[PDB]
Write a protein that binds this DNA or RNA. Structure first.
Length: 54
RNA sequence: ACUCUGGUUUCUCUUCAGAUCGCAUAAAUCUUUCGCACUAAAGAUUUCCGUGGAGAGGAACAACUCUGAGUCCAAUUUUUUGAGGCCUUGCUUUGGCAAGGCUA
């Protein structure tokens, strides 16, 4: 709500080996763009890499 | 259903390639841009990693699979018959032609 209104107002008015966390994106206010519904792939497809049993 | 090409693999050389030439992705230089240039963008050039096409030469075994080419029908509907014979007129190229009327 407050971040909602603030976004509306804004729109209309050394060797660093590790990346700085300030460069992160996806720090969003809309709950639809944070809690994205996860694809289930009919319960038979799985994401690569992660352990299958998990 | 008979006969004659073309093979495939490998090594080297020549040329073209703005085609995801590469279902991957480096580096250098110059210019511009703003910061104030590894922690940044644009444009251009170059060098590298290494390709496809075509052509040429070498050398190893397969030679006709494939790609081609040259090489059983008489009964309605077609190709196993309704065919041939008589009469008049125009012209006879005096052989008969054309149309009609017929008999089968």
């Amino acid at each position: 709500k407050s971040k909602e209104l603030h976004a509306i107002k804004e729109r209309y008015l050394k060797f660093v080996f590790e990346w700085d966390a300030s460069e992160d994106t996806s720090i969003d206010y809309n709950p639809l763009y944070k809690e994205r519904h996860q694809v289930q792939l009919l319960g038979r497809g799985f994401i690569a890499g992660i352990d299958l049993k998990q």
